[PDB]
Design a protein around this ligand. Sequence first.
Ligand SMILES: O=C(CCN1CCN(C(=O)OCc2cc(Cl)cc(Cl)c2)CC1)c1ccc2[nH]c(=O)oc2c1
Ligand SMILES: *[C@@H]1O[C@H](CO)[C@@H](O[C@@H]2O[C@H](CO)[C@@H](O)[C@H](O)[C@H]2NC(C)=O)[C@H](O)[C@H]1NC(C)=O
Ligand SMILES: [Ca+2]
Ligand SMILES: [Cl-]
Ligand SMILES: [Zn+2]
Ligand SMILES: [Zn+2]
Length: 777
Amino acid sequence: ATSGSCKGRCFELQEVGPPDCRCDNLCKSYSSCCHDFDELCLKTARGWECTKDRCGEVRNEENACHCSEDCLSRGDCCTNYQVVCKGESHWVDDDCEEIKVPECPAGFVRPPLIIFSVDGFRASYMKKGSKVMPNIEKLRSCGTHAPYMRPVYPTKTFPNLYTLATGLYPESHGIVGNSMYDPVFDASFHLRGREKFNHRWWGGQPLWITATKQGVRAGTFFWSVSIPHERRILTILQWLSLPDNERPSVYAFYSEQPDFSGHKYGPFGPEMTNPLREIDKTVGQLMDGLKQLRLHRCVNVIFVGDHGMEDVTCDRTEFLSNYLTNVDDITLVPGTLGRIRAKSIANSKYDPKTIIAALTCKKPDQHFKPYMKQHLPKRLHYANNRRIEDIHLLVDRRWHVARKPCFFQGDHGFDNKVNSMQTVFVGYGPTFKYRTKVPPFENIELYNVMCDLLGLKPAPNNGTHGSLNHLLRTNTFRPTMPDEVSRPNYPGIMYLQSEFDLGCTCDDTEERHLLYGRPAVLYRTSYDILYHTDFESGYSEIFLMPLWTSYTISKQAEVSSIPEHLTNCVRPDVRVSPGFSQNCLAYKNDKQMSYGFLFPPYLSSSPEAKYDAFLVTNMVPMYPAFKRVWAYFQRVLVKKYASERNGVNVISGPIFDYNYDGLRDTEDEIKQYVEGSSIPVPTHYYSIITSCLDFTQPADKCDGPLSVSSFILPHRPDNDESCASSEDESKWVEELMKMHTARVRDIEHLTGLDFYRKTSRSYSEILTLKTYLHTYE
Ligand SMILES: O=C(CCN1CCN(C(=O)OCc2cc(Cl)cc(Cl)c2)CC1)c1ccc2[nH]c(=O)oc2c1
Ligand SMILES: *[C@@H]1O[C@H](CO)[C@@H](O[C@@H]2O[C@H](CO)[C@@H](O)[C@H](O)[C@H]2NC(C)=O)[C@H](O)[C@H]1NC(C)=O
Ligand SMILES: [Ca+2]
Ligand SMILES: [Cl-]
Ligand SMILES: [Zn+2]
Ligand SMILES: [Zn+2]
């Protein structure tokens, strides 16, 4: 039960509990405002602009904003008041001048951060909308900007907005979609409903909580949709005109446009010009309002978006009624992505194996692919959450998925790799750089950058702190390279060949191959460094295989066959013991399992050096199905990349992620082994393919920035993911690798390793290199 009024309390910062009634920006969404909130706090009279007649006004309380002589004192002028009355120019009409320091008025200790989020703002609107968006174009052109910013999967509103606030993946922070079902709560998250306002859904620590816990005044970023954009801007300016001990440091504006129009008219419709003009007008109001308060050279403005917008029509819609016999007996989260769940009551004959088999490669031009969430590409980071359904359908761009058979011309939620889903970033202000383009980056990196701008120690998150230091002029975070916990052994020749009874038979460096220093193991283990002519290895003495195998292949390297006499060759390693070696007898007895090699025998320097490739310490357990993919990569693709990139350095190895949390498994978490043995079966295999950005310099004699592409290939007993897998490997293998492309940082979480420790590059640039994703778009 509550009582009171919002006289002199409109848009209060402190969230007031009972017995007082609320007057903050979210009070309408909880149905908790005082009786007279709409009359006092949401006035619209005489619009949002001063005219000449209004100048030199007598104050009228009914007005939305004022043009009186005493408006500047109270801090509630209309944004154009000084332009129309006092003869100032609009901010957009001023020529750009570099902001070396925070040019702030008295009382402002640190530059405030204003986060200007825009819903569904596609990356290519910056160039395409330039002429109708002059204010935005001044921020982009004269501030710091990227060509695009990558969202998180699924590319939807609530997962991305809360990812911008937390720096976490949707699997971690809990908002895995715009719709969700939690089996533990036995309740449903929806866009239309009161359930979304409950805090139990919202994990992690959002930026505004991170501020207030560290003494910095912030307040919640969420606005009620009923509040018009001009009232949101005016309120933000009103908060900036509060006294020193009441004024917030961080501010958030939100625009539902261009998303709302984008769904109806498509991303580039003729009706889409006005939405973009209004968004620019809203920015021009902010900058004119900031210039009016002398904060246009003081504030840092981040202009960011949650996701893009793709052309999606009701004609391009795939129906699961065409594939499944009993489509009425399953729940689907439909549209630009698919999540399948079983109906609870009277449906004991439900089977996820039957559903995935029934949806796998049935139409030739099939516009979606079924995955178990564990088999989804690791770049998506969409698995480790009970709210994420086991069955997932990854929908093709431009298409929809539904159960059974327009209102919309556009949509979003596809793979975050897709061009149309890419969104925007512009930093403008004293702490940002001037007229500086930067490489595109992931939205998970932004939380750290906002914390640096506010002087906050960020809560644990999925950004890589330091990777966006090149965006900022000052206030950078000094990134410390993580300390290596396990030092390597360097074993000499300690074992005779007759000591090995492995059931195996066969008729029988550092500067060249380890270019960036050795990887550092950041967990407590026991491993050996093995040197060879063509490759170096960090051989795990617990997992009985390399953690990494490093090798460089020059532009003019030889690709050769495996001879007939070395077809089933496996040599013992005289540096590593019989007890810490794999055995061939396990592979003979395991019918479903075979073996492969991390360093390819195909790329050996000579017939003499080739025998090093068949060492037992180089072999790894591979399913025959996967062995087709790995062998083609090794035989054809590695040489291809070396030829194209003027040599390449490859770092290959296993990954164990049976609990699908994106982290390296401990020995206890490994859920499968080779038959009758301690040889563990990896869930994935990685390769980090590094070369010189300057293509004129070779890979092994490179100075200047490095270039990299990597992947995390799933280790599968079949090739059901690749519909062309019946055909020759050149028609499908490289397409699979492209879908499972990864960052070096993704591999580091999954392996507990740390790469690029000895280079001639700054560590901030190396962290930027580790966060890079090669998208093939
Ligand atoms: O109805 C909505 C919006 C619902 N709310 C979103 C959150 N919100 C807000 O102000 O975000 C503020 C904010 C919060 C955070 Cl964590 C971080 C930042 Cl940087 C900013 C209030 C409105 C909507 C929008 C797009 C949609 N596309 C679709 O298919 O359905 C849709 C529904
Ligand atoms: C992304 O980062 C988050 C936060 O560091 C990680 O989630 C935490 O993981 C640990 C270990 O499982 C738990 O103790 C925490 O409770 C988790 N959540 C939070 C909110 O702190 C997550 O593992 C990271 N993911 C990846 C792929 O690196
Ligand atoms: Ca794991
Ligand atoms: Cl969703
Ligand atoms: Zn959105
Ligand atoms: Zn939308």
